[PDB]
Design a protein around this ligand. Structure first.
Ligand SMILES: c1ccc2c(c1)[nH]c1[nH]cn[n+]12
Ligand SMILES: [Cl-]
Length: 284
């Protein structure tokens, strides 16, 4: 019913759908597998963000085509989406949750340090590097991201003779937008550890909205008894209603659940294993 642009076709051979829009492709030059995200005709900001960022737990953009549709050429993540590992009460072993979560915190810490809020962190935006359970993860889908309160800061420089009270009231919470990412991470971690969502409409009277605002997650003890008290304590500190009290990425990384030298060693191992193919000889 349509064709690929001549500019894309020149550099790549298009193949099978990976996610439905993400297709598999081969770079003609290298014969290496790539991932091509097709967006129907925001994408300009997403490219701008992707190009500037450089972290091993954040997806890299390889190329871009602005045609009848937008084509974003990205690194292929063979393991697919983390969603596929947690769907329909499927659960990850605590050790796997830790390894993936640690990387997610490093990735999100990097974003916040670089003035970027993702705003749409979910298992569908967390990609696995291989079909192995001990693998590298990367955050994707920067379409809803924000670049960090200059409008309020400038307003405060003047005399508030004519300034509205709601604006002065907003000074209290201003600059805590990044806390939304820490909430999302808390929800992801809950799902990964238990196989079930903390807030849902399944077998409950209370509205999904009321559950979230009260911060009263559904706690099923039979499920959680299999999970450590440390892992649950970290979830608890991220699923905090007050964004000013909620755990930051630094506080989450300093948590006892993350003070695991074995998990840290396994991640560094996976890094060197990935980076061995690109490593140039160095001055000793
Ligand atoms: C399944 C769905 C999306 C995918 C994928 C496999 N691999 C990869 N690399 C970038 N996005 N993406
Ligand atoms: Cl075609």
């Amino acid at each position: 019913m349509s064709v690929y642009p001549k500019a894309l076709r020149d550099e790549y051979i298009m193949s099978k759908t990976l996610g439905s829009e993400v297709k598999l492709a081969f770079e003609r030059k290298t014969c290496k597998k790539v991932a091509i995200k097709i967006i129907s005709k925001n994408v300009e900001t997403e490219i701008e963000i992707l190009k500037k960022l450089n972290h091993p737990c954040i997806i890299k953009i390889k190329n871009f085509f602005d045609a009848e549709d937008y084509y974003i050429v990205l690194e292929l993540m063979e393991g697919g989406e983390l969603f596929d590992k947690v769907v329909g009460n499927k659960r990850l072993k605590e050790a796997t949750c830790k390894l993936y979560f640690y990387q997610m915190l490093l990735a999100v810490q990097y974003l916040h340090e670089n003035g970027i809020i993702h705003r749409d962190l979910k298992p569908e935006n967390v990609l696995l590097s291989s079909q192995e359970e001990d693998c590298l993860i990367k955050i994707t889908d920067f379409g809803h991201s924000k670049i960090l309160e200059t409008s309020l800061m400038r307003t405060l420089c003047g005399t508030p003779t004519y300034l509205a009270p709601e604006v002065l009231v907003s000074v209290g919470t201003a600059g805590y937008n990044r806390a939304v990412d820490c909430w999302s991470l808390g929800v992801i971690l809950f799902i990964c550890l238990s196989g079930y969502p903390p807030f849902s409409e399944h077998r409950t009277q209370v509205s999904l909205k009321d559950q979230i605002t009260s911060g009263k997650y559904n706690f099923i003890p039979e499920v959680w008894a299999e999970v450590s008290e440390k892992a649950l304590d970290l979830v608890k500190k991220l699923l905090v209603v007050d964004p000013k009290a909620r755990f930051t990425t630094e506080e989450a990384l300093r948590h006892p659940w993350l003070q695991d030298e074995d998990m840290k060693r396994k991640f560094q191992d996976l890094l060197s294993e990935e980076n061995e193919s690109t490593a140039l000889p160095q001055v000793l």
